[PDB]
Amino acid sequence: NQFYKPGMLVPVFSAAGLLKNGRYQFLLQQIETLSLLPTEQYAQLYEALVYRFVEFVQVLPIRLDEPLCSLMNEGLLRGVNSLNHYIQNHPEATPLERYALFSAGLLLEVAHAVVNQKIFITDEEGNFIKQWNPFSGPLIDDVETKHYKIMPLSSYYQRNIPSITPILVRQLLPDEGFLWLTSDMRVFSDWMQALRDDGRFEHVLQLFKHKNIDGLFNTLPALPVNLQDSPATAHADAFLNWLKEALATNQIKVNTSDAGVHVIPEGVFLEKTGIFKQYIDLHVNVPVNLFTVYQQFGNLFGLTKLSGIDYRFEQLFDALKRKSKMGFAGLSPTREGVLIADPNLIFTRGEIPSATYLKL
Amino acid sequence: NQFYKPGMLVPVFSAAGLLKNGRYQFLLQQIETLSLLPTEQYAQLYEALVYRFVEFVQVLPIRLDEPLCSLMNEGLLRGVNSLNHYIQNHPEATPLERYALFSAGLLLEVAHAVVNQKIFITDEEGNFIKQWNPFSGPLIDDVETKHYKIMPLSSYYQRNIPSITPILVRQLLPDEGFLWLTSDMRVFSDWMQALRDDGRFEHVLQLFKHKNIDGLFNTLPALPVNLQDSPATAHADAFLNWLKEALATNQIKVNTSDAGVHVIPEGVFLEKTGIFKQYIDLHVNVPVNLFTVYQQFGNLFGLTKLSGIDYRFEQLFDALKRKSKMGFAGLSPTREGVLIADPNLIFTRGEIPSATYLKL
Structure with missing residues (x-):
C-alpha cells in the first residue's frame, strides 16, 4: 500500500x-x-x-x-x-x-x-x-x-x-x-x-x-x-507545506498591516517581501534565497502560463505615513505578490478568513 | 390564468x-x-x-x-x-x-x-x-x-x-x-x-x-x-380518472382473486373483463360498451405502438377449482389485460400497494 x-x-x-x-x-x-x-x-x-x-x-x-x-x-x-x-x-x-x-x-x-x-x-x-x-x-x-x-x-x-x-x-x-x-x-x-x-x-x-x-x-x-521528484518546484513545495501548517495553527498575521498574507474577495494574496521573506528568515538552515523560492512558486502555480488563470501576479494598494512617524521614511504604496483565486488550496485545514484593507 | x-x-x-x-x-x-x-x-x-x-x-x-x-x-x-x-x-x-x-x-x-x-x-x-x-x-x-x-x-x-x-x-x-x-x-x-x-x-x-x-x-x-379535445381516447380518459379516484379511496379490490387490478413487480395489471367491466357495470348512464372503452385505453397508452414499451398487453396465471365448487364450471386459468409498467401513473394520490398471487 x-x-x-x-x-x-x-x-x-x-x-x-x-x-x-x-x-x-x-x-x-x-x-x-x-x-x-x-x-x-x-x-x-x-x-x-x-x-x-x-x-x-x-x-x-x-x-x-x-x-x-x-x-x-x-x-x-x-x-x-x-x-x-x-x-x-x-x-x-x-x-x-x-x-x-x-x-x-x-x-x-x-x-x-x-x-x-x-x-x-x-x-x-x-x-x-x-x-x-x-x-x-x-x-x-x-x-x-x-x-x-x-x-x-x-x-x-x-x-x-x-x-x-x-x-x-x-x-x-x-x-x-x-x-x-x-x-x-x-x-x-x-x-x-x-x-x-x-x-x-x-x-x-x-x-x-x-x-x-x-x-x-x-x-x-x-x-x-x-x-x-519535482526539482523545478521543490523549495516552493516546502514553502507551501510550511505555509499551510502555520496558517492551520494561527502562526501568521493575515489581513493586518504587518502581515504578508491577505484575503480579499478575489482570493488569497501572498506578498513577496512579506510571507516568502518571513519563511526565509524563520528557516536559517535551508539553502535557498528569496529569489529561488519565489521563482519556484511561480513554476509551481503556472505564473508565466496563460492556462494558469487562477494564479497570477498582482499588486494591491496610511502605510507610508506610518513609516514616516514610526520608521525613517521621513528622511510606493503598492504591495507586490501572488494571488491564488481559490483559498481552499491554502487554508486546507480550517476556516477561510473573511475578506478584510488592501484592494486591486 | x-x-x-x-x-x-x-x-x-x-x-x-x-x-x-x-x-x-x-x-x-x-x-x-x-x-x-x-x-x-x-x-x-x-x-x-x-x-x-x-x-x-x-x-x-x-x-x-x-x-x-x-x-x-x-x-x-x-x-x-x-x-x-x-x-x-x-x-x-x-x-x-x-x-x-x-x-x-x-x-x-x-x-x-x-x-x-x-x-x-x-x-x-x-x-x-x-x-x-x-x-x-x-x-x-x-x-x-x-x-x-x-x-x-x-x-x-x-x-x-x-x-x-x-x-x-x-x-x-x-x-x-x-x-x-x-x-x-x-x-x-x-x-x-x-x-x-x-x-x-x-x-x-x-x-x-x-x-x-x-x-x-x-x-x-x-x-x-x-x-x-381527445376524441380517440375520451371514454378511456373518463375510465382513467374514475380508476384513480376509486383507488385513491379503496373502492377497488386489488391483488385478491375477485379483483380486476393486480400489482406485480412488473407494474399494475388491469384485467379487461375485470376492472373495465366493473366500470361499465357501475355507470349505467354512460353510452359506451366494454369494447370501446378497452380499445380507447389501447389508443391512450399506445398498446399497438412499439414505442409504448411501458404499456403492453399481458396474460397472468385454485381459480378453476373455486369455480367448480362455488359456481357451475363443474358442468383457461389465464387473466387477460393491460400491464402499465409504472404504477405511479395510476396510484397518483396514495401508496403503491405491495406486489402480492398471479405471475407472468
Whole structure:
C-alpha cells in the first residue's frame, strides 16, 4: 500500500495500463457473465464504462490519507460484489437492474476526483503546464499529458458531492447506457437514489459498506506507482507545506498591516517581501534565497502560463505615513505578490478568513 | 390564468412562438444590459439558454394545480429579478457571477418537467404516438411532434429532484456556458448550492421566494393555450380518472382473486373483463360498451405502438377449482389485460400497494 507524498509527480496511465493485471481481466469476464448480455452489448455498456471510469480516476485515492488506486479498486469491488450479492438474492433481476446496480456501485465516489484535490498537469521537472478540468474529460484526452501533481483542497467542497455525482455519471456512462437507464423510471429513480449514498439497491450497497457482502472478489492489486521528484518546484513545495501548517495553527498575521498574507474577495494574496521573506528568515538552515523560492512558486502555480488563470501576479494598494512617524521614511504604496483565486488550496485545514484593507 | 384539464391535448410551440410578446423581448434586452457582455456572447450564453429552457418546459405548469406557462414565467422572473437585485447590492459582481445567478434562478425548477408528469406525444385525435424522454431533448427535436397529453405522476419522484436538476442543467446550458462556470470553483460551488433550493446567492434567491425582491419585471403574460379535445381516447380518459379516484379511496379490490387490478413487480395489471367491466357495470348512464372503452385505453397508452414499451398487453396465471365448487364450471386459468409498467401513473394520490398471487 502506497500513499501520495505532498509535492511528488504521478505518472499518467492509460486504462489498458491500469487494467492489465489478470485479476481485473477476470473481474471483467465475471461481470460479462453476470450481465446477461451478449458480448457486443457487454463491451458497449459495461466494458466501456469501466475503461472510461479508470481513465478518469487514474490512481487517485478515495481520500488523501488512503492508498493510491483505492478510488478505482473500491469502485470495481463495490460494483462486482454488490451485483453478485444482489443477483444471488434476486435471481430474476433484469439486465437493466443489473447494469444499474453495477454502475451505481462503480461510480458512487467518482465526485472525489473533483472535490478532494486539484490536479496540476506538469512537465517531467514539475513545472505547471495546465490545471485539469475534470468536467472536460479525463487526463488522457491530451496525449501530451504525462505527469501531474495532486494539490489538496479543504473539505469545503464535500457539500457539492450530491450535485457533482449525477453530472459526472452522465459524463462517464456510454450514451446508450444512460439512455437505457432512462427507459424505466422506477429503475432510474432507484439508481439515482443509490448514487446519493448518505430504493431496491439501498440494502446491498449498505451491506457493502459494512463489509457484510458475499463477494466474488476479495481484493484487487495496487500496482506500484513510480512517484517522481519535482526539482523545478521543490523549495516552493516546502514553502507551501510550511505555509499551510502555520496558517492551520494561527502562526501568521493575515489581513493586518504587518502581515504578508491577505484575503480579499478575489482570493488569497501572498506578498513577496512579506510571507516568502518571513519563511526565509524563520528557516536559517535551508539553502535557498528569496529569489529561488519565489521563482519556484511561480513554476509551481503556472505564473508565466496563460492556462494558469487562477494564479497570477498582482499588486494591491496610511502605510507610508506610518513609516514616516514610526520608521525613517521621513528622511510606493503598492504591495507586490501572488494571488491564488481559490483559498481552499491554502487554508486546507480550517476556516477561510473573511475578506478584510488592501484592494486591486 | 389557464389550468390543464386532465385528458386534453396541448399544442407544441417553438421558443420563438413562446417568446414573441414584447414583454419577453424587453426582458431579454434588460438581461443583455445586466450581463456586461458584448452582443455575440450574450446571444451565445444567455439568449441561447433562455430559448433552450422555454423549448424544453413549453407551457407546463410548475405543479399540476398551477397555471399554464408558470414554469417558464417563474423561471424567467426569478432569473431577471434575482440578477437585478443582486447587482444592486453588489455593483462589482463579475460577468461570471451574473451568468451563474441568472442561470440558477432560471433553471431552479426545471426537474418539474420530469417528475410531475409523463408526456404522451399524440396525433390530432389523441392517439398515443410515443412518450417524451426529456433526457434526449425537448419535444421540438422531432419536427412532427405537434400535440401531447400531460399524464400526472404521484409525488414519489420528487425525491429525485436533487439528482435530476444538475443533469438537466448541464443538458440545457450551452457548452461554453457550463465550461465558463467550471472555470471558477468557488462560483461553481455556490451555483450548484443555489440549484439545490431546499453560498453567495442563497440570500437573493430566498428574497425571491418570500416576495421581498426589488424587481425589473412584475409579471409576465400567460399566452392563451388552445387545448383540444381527445376524441380517440375520451371514454378511456373518463375510465382513467374514475380508476384513480376509486383507488385513491379503496373502492377497488386489488391483488385478491375477485379483483380486476393486480400489482406485480412488473407494474399494475388491469384485467379487461375485470376492472373495465366493473366500470361499465357501475355507470349505467354512460353510452359506451366494454369494447370501446378497452380499445380507447389501447389508443391512450399506445398498446399497438412499439414505442409504448411501458404499456403492453399481458396474460397472468385454485381459480378453476373455486369455480367448480362455488359456481357451475363443474358442468383457461389465464387473466387477460393491460400491464402499465409504472404504477405511479395510476396510484397518483396514495401508496403503491405491495406486489402480492398471479405471475407472468
